Write a protein that binds this ligand. Structure first.
Ligand SMILES: Nc1ncnc2c1ncn2[C@@H]1O[C@@H]2CO[P@](O)(=S)O[C@H]2[C@H]1O
Ligand SMILES: Nc1ncnc2c1ncn2[C@@H]1O[C@@H]2CO[P@](O)(=S)O[C@H]2[C@H]1O
Ligand SMILES: Nc1ncnc2c1ncn2[C@@H]1O[C@@H]2CO[P@](O)(=S)O[C@H]2[C@H]1O
Ligand SMILES: Nc1ncnc2c1ncn2[C@@H]1O[C@@H]2CO[P@](O)(=S)O[C@H]2[C@H]1O
Lengths: 200, 201
């Protein structure tokens, strides 16, 4: 992809090990990132340090983009590497010059912003309108149709901790365990360790 | 400024009365709108027809923008006029031609998308982390911080109905009215008119 190749030639690229923080909430935003390889989690926290994952992003995703548009703003969320990552970085000032040369690179960025607004709006709906059981069931459904889910005789096999589920749906790890047991009892999933088979 | 003037010269401008739907969820998206005058709400609905307000947008805001980026998408939300609106309309096709001329028009639209994603992300946190009283309290704090809030000797004065708060936080107007009376009793707010004063705001 020539447009992305051109953009990346103007970036400087860096390796982040698994679990490192790319972006800290509250930092002053002056640069844009783009994931060349790997995946990250975007998260927010409450007064007590409970975490809610807003999104996973992966190869091909921009990160740190929301600052490009307002002079001197603070990063709104933490971004943590879930795997080893290779990340390209560019200042906003240089990226604005690229936009002038070829506004297709802004279109690519803005397409991902629009998708993220839709996804996050759906999350608002889920938190407002679904109970925690329905949120968990929708999450397991989603993880099963992810590229990293492994086919199984009876559905798809996924690997996720109860803690990570609770960070997606907004509940404690104890509440996750109780709901997973219920779904097992209903013959809708199987659960063994960090492994869950989602039937159907 | 004259960027906005030039853009509006390529649009068709039309009027929506108060309460009328501009965009329905599920319609095919092929056109972008820009609010010349008025205010709208962006809304989603649950299975029982309960509504939740995702955003209020105003003069200078783009609406219907999210479908510009990928061909053949559905509208993701309803957009309903709060006051009567005058809205400029342009096809996605024509708008993409204007972007080549001056991409500041896409910068302005994307700055608004960026802000909306931050507001909606904060809403995810509030719904995950706060109970209904806490969500009402944060809604009042958010309204007291807005440009359109009025300085008052006890704090900031806002204008918002109980039904409006309920559609924002996800509760009935009667639940809102009970909780505002409670907050008043804790000496945190005044009710009164159509009007709430958020103390220490
Ligand atoms: N709801 C959401 N969905 C996806 N990415 C998000 C998000 N909220 C914030 N981010 C990302 O998290 C980053 C935090 O730094 P920013 O410069 S505000 O840019 C932000 C986006 O890249
Ligand atoms: N309302 C909620 N209650 C409890 N935990 C929550 C929560 N919303 C998000 N979380 C996160 O979900 C996590 C699930 O595992 P924990 O180790 S109990 O830590 C929890 C918090 O970090
Ligand atoms: N969370 C949100 N905040 C603000 N506006 C939103 C929103 N979700 C959707 N919208 C607006 O609602 C519109 C519905 O039609 P679209 O073409 S998907 O464009 C959408 C945006 O203008
Ligand atoms: N959990 C909930 N309970 C009641 N109303 C809710 C709700 N979530 C969203 N709403 C909406 O909030 C509105 C507040 O005013 P109503 O006229 S009672 O109509 C209500 C519903 O449309």
């Amino acid at each position: 992809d020539p447009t992305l190749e051109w953009f990346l030639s103007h970036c400087h690229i860096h390796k982040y090990p698994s679990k490192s923080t790319l972006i800290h909430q509250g930092e002053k935003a002056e640069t844009l990132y783009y994931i060349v390889k790997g995946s990250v989690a975007v998260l927010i926290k409450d007064e007590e340090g409970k975490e809610m994952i807003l999104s996973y992003l992966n190869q091909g995703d921009f990160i740190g983009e929301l600052g490009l548009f307002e002079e001197g703003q603070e990063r709104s969320a933490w971004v943590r590497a879930k795997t080893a990552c290779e990340v390209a970085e560019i200042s906003y000032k240089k990226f604005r010059q690229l936009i002038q040369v070829n506004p297709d690179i802004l279109m690519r960025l803005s397409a991902q912003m629009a998708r993220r607004l839709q996804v996050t709006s759906e999350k608002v709906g889920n938190l407002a309108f679904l109970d925690v059981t329905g949120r968990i069931a929708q999450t397991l459904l989603n993880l099963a149709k992810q590229p990293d889910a492994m086919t199984h005789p009876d559905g798809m096999q996924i690997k996720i901790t109860r803690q990570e589920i609770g960070q997606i749906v907004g509940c404690s790890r104890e509440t996750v365990g109780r709901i997973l047991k219920m779904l097992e009892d209903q013959n809708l999933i199987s659960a063994h360790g960090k492994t869950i088979v989602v039937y159907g």
